[PDB]
Amino acid sequence: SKLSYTSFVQMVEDERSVVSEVVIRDDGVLRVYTKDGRVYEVDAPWAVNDSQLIEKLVSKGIKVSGER
Amino acid sequence: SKLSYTSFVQMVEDERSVVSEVVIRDDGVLRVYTKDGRVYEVDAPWAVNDSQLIEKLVSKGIKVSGER
Amino acid sequence: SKLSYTSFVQMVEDERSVVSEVVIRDDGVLRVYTKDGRVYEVDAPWAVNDSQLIEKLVSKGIKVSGE
Amino acid sequence: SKLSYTSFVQMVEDERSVVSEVVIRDDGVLRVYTKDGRVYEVDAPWAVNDSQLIEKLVSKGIKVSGE
Amino acid sequence: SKLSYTSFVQMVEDERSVVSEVVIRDDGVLRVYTKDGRVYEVDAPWAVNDSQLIEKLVSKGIKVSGER
Amino acid sequence: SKLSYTSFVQMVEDERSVVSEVVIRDDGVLRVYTKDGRVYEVDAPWAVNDSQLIEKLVSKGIKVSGER
């Protein structure tokens, strides 16, 4: 399902965050997996080198995986 | 309607911001929507790299998405 | 053989880290050697030229090199 | 046998956690069982009645109980 | 060496933080070890149940150990 | 000099705070020092539990220490 960048950040920040995995594709799309078994596509080429976002995901224990 | 990046940035940082949505297109054009039903086009191929900008948008709850 | 960036960072941070050595390839695939003799590949282009990661590895006693 | 609170939390967070079960004693010593058959004691009185820790353990599939 | 609570927090927050270990004693004293091989005593009974401080130390990779 | 906890709290939260140091004694007395060379005693056995207070002090760079 298409998911906006804002809504993606909203999901990450949720105190009961449902985000299990973020796959950072080399084409600038993030595939975002939830603990309830959904997957979303976020078109966000700016995110792929955003170290602040990445270490935030990691610190939350969200699985971060590159893809090519 | 045409809008300079310079003006866009101030529209964003304005506490009374009229901005409701920003689409960052891969051709370097930003489509900027306002609360009052206007849409603007901003030519700014550098905007994908303006981390301060995009985090700022999301922090204010503005809908940000990428397009291609 | 594939290892997530998250699990990589956890392994680096571990109080008893099993990480021996990391090679940061220009293509953004890290090769990660562990003390148990295993080797992993971490797809993480954001890690290339990440000074903070490099300093972290060095500070943990992990051997780090590039190409 | 002694395990730091930091290493305990790392083990709980690990993408491939080896933690099977935690017993939160009233005296603030946690007993931590790992899948490799080891048992650790974590001196952490702050963990008693820590709802956030309890929810975290449960969410990671780790068995948690008190006395 | 005696170390104030403020100075302790100062050491934790240092971007090149020299703190390696904090032992939280049941008597309300923190023993604080540095990477350069010093040890400090911080009289701070309020710290021992401060979950915000504790998870902050843990998130930094500082070794946190209870003592009795 | 005698000082109520009520007044102490406002002295702390004051943006023009005169407070330079606070000693939290285990007998429940706070010794409060000001920039102009005054010292006050505050009877407040609950102060060791006022997390908002102590973090506030440290965030403003006030020297906080425990005594016994």
Curated annotation (Swiss-Prot), chains A, B, E, F:
**Source species, domain of life:** Bacteria
Where's it found, cell-wise? Cell inner membrane
**Which stretches are Periplasmic in the membrane topology?**
1-68
| Quaternary structure, from the entry | The isolated ADP-bound cytosolic domain forms a 6-fold symmetric protease disk and a 2-fold symmetric AAA ATPase ring. In the absence of nucleotide the AAA ATPase ring also forms symmetric hexamers.
Its biological purpose is as follows: Acts as a processive, ATP-dependent zinc metallopeptidase for both cytoplasmic and membrane proteins. Plays a role in the quality control of integral membrane proteins.
The entry's family comment says: In the central section; belongs to the AAA ATPase family. In the C-terminal section; belongs to the peptidase M41 family.
Protein's name according to its UniProt entry: ATP-dependent zinc metalloprotease FtsH
Q: What is the species of this protein?
A: Thermotoga maritima (strain ATCC 43589 / DSM 3109 / JCM 10099 / NBRC 100826 / MSB8)
UniProt lineage: Bacteria, Thermotogati, Thermotogota, Thermotogae, Thermotogales
Gene of this entry: ftsH
Question: Parent protein range shown?
Answer: 34 to 101 of 610
